[PDB]
Design a protein around this ligand. Structure first.
Ligand SMILES: CCCCC/C=C/C/C=C\CCCCCCCC(=O)OC[C@H](COP(=O)([O-])OCC[N+](C)(C)C)OC(=O)CCCCCCC/C=C\C/C=C/CCCCC
Ligand SMILES: CCCCC/C=C/C/C=C\CCCCCCCC(=O)OC[C@H](COP(=O)([O-])OCC[N+](C)(C)C)OC(=O)CCCCCCC/C=C\C/C=C/CCCCC
Ligand SMILES: O=C(O)Cc1c[nH]c2ccccc12
Ligand SMILES: O=C(O)Cc1c[nH]c2ccccc12
Lengths: 327, 327
């Protein structure tokens, strides 16, 4: 059959390595009292400045920009626009935190959750197993687009919000803060090198590949360690409160995938493309958005509980959507 | 015909990644002003507490305790004893930094220099190329013994010195500081697991293997990053000064290899064992001892200027010793 206990074991064995790093970081920050808050911030700074850029480059460079399916990109952009419209409309009617002011900061922490699943680590063992090798290849384009356009746009939104804390000058300041970022350079060099490699066949030198790998290899372990450190910093696992936690998880696991269903139907995705493009949306929050929020101090307590409690519901949620799509 | 420009290229391409990580760390600490001294200390603390133990375990577990050559272990112990004796005799007459006290710290640094080469990363490309695949296994045994006994003894000496800043009480305090050290637990679990794996055939579960790898993969990149950060902290690249730099370089690249030659001759190592055991000592200083010194703030200035300017002389030094041994 499509689903088996062997698939469940592969999914669980893919997830547990992340929770081991998370728990080690949390214990080292809280129980073992190893890293002071400044040192935890320094570890997260290293992760955001040297481990994510050096892995965004690896993701983007190892995809052919010319074979990316236009339908998938159109569907993803349509999802993102629909989610942005819905979130903006909702805030006008009721703002969170007791109906106070401020659209950005929430229109950013809602896009960090709703429209940025975890695909590289957990999406593969789940969906490639459920739907075979085709799902892996289809989701590879989604992951590369995520690292290519969406993280850069999210960083621009973060820095625009930071600047906002005299209308074109703010945008210019946001742009200037963007250019000096290492993520933008990582993605630009990644796309340029993907072009060169897949057009002129310029294989990256082994020396440079090894030098990049030395720093990028531990990126995921360090990122989950940083999430654990922050968890230790926060008083409770559900640091945003139950109500906000309910709304955050609802946005992540119902609205995001439902709007992806709407987008896939609108773009007329056929057969596996329609099915594999929506089960990807209903996936854990990820820890790149968490890294950005923690560095920018933009309501990371919402991202934390989402990451911790969504890697337990990604598998059941994908099973539920797969059963729903069967008939 | 034993040495070729292709060998030089492999050695250089194995060394360059470490210098890339080092330079990135140094720039990030000095020119880019990213990590404050506290954050640099936090990154180094993470490296010492999570990256080295999780790699000492990987090194020790993958060895076969029942296939270690007794002659190699005896030769290594004899070299270490001869060194310790020579350093103690020298410290009696002339003390470093003029005539002062502090024998234990200076002998600890002298041992960290003379009797702890770099074999895992640079020894394999260099001596395996010079002497073929035969030297690979012998150097592997040297590396396993290094991670098994010598690093633990070095940590005990470091903590004894720290506790000395009422004779059996100090030793007991050193032991208590040792037991809580993550490195000793990593080495003990590693040796026990190697015993289990190579005696009863137990295989480490895939889940646990991936959990360990997530954190241990970036260990070397982060270690070189930390060394670069410390370099940025120091006023000049030759932090200890020329005279002390001359004495440190001499201790590492003449006394160490010379005493290893004496030890190999005494133990009657035959043919490749005699040659491979002495060309390994004349190798860079390594960055595990630097990590320990930086954590314990015990003259890391003398280790940084070796880890740099020794990875340039490791290749010519190996060529020189190989030529000397030919006739
Ligand atoms: C054949 C070759 C193929 C390509 C090989 C590519 C390999 C590498 C791939 C991707 C890039 C990985 C980057 C990882 C390290 C990033 C470190 C970094 O830079 O951290 C951002 C840094 C900090 O900025 P801040 O404002 O936070 O702090 C400033 C504070 N205070 C105002 C007080 C000074 O940024 C600054 O300093 C601003 C200055 C620029 C920062 C970015 C420098 C690195 C990026 C591009 C330049 C060249 C790279 C390699 C060669 C490419 C091809 C020519
Ligand atoms: C089939 C299975 C095969 C085996 C699989 C195992 C793989 C693991 C391999 C190697 C170990 C890697 C350890 C890496 C993390 C180490 C972190 C750590 O521990 O950092 C040292 C920590 C801090 O000490 P501190 O004094 O610096 O600060 C205390 C300050 N203040 C007094 C204020 C509280 O130490 C303390 O807290 C002291 C307490 C002990 C610290 C060490 C804990 C980890 C080691 C062993 C325990 C169990 C391990 C796993 C199971 C093994 C098999 C049964
Ligand atoms: O889930 C992923 O896409 C992997 C991932 C998330 N944040 C990271 C930070 C550093 C290295 C890898 C990752
Ligand atoms: O043995 C080596 O040269 C590799 C090495 C030195 N220090 C380290 C710290 C963390 C991970 C690997 C290493």
């Amino acid at each position: 059959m499509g689903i088996s206990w062997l698939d469940i074991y592969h999914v669980v064995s893919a997830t547990v390595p992340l929770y081991v790093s998370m728990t080690l970081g949390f214990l080292s920050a809280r129980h073992l009292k190893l890293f002071s808050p400044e040192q935890c911030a320094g570890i997260n700074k290293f992760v955001a400045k040297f481990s994510i850029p050096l892995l965004s480059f690896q993701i983007i460079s190892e995809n052919n920009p010319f074979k990316m399916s236009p339908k998938l990109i159109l569907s993803d952009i349509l999802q993102k626009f629909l989610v942005v419209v819905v979130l903006a409309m909702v805030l006008r009617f009721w703002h969170p935190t007791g109906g106070r002011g401020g659209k950005l900061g929430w229109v950013i922490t809602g896009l960090s959750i709703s429209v940025l699943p975890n695909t590289l680590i957990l999406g593969m063992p789940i969906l490639s197993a459920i739907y075979g090798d085709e799902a892996a290849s289809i989701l590879e384009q989604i992951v590369v687009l995520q690292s290519l356009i969406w993280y850069t746009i999210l960083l621009f939104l973060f820095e625009l919000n930071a600047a906002r804390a005299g209308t074109m000058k703010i945008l210019l300041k946001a742009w200037r803060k963007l250019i000096i970022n290492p993520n933008t350079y990582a993605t630009l060099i990644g796309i340029i090198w993907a072009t060169l490699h897949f057009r002129l066949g310029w294989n990256l030198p082994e020396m440079i590949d090894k030098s990049i790998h030395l720093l990028s290899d531990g990126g995921l372990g360090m990122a989950m360690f940083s999430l654990g450190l922050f968890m230790a910093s926060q008083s409770s696992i559900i640091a945003c409160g139950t109500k906000m936690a309910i709304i955050t998880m609802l946005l992540k696991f119902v609205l995001g995938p439902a709007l992806m269903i709407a987008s896939a139907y609108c773009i007329r995705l056929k057969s596996t493309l329609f099915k594999v493009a929506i089960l990807q949306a209903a996936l854990p929050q990820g820890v790149v958005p968490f890294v950005f929020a923690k560095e920018y101090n933009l309501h990371p307590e919402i991202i934390s509980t989402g990451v911790i409690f969504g890697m337990l519901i990604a598998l059941p949620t994908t099973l539920a959507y797969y059963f729903l799509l069967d008939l």
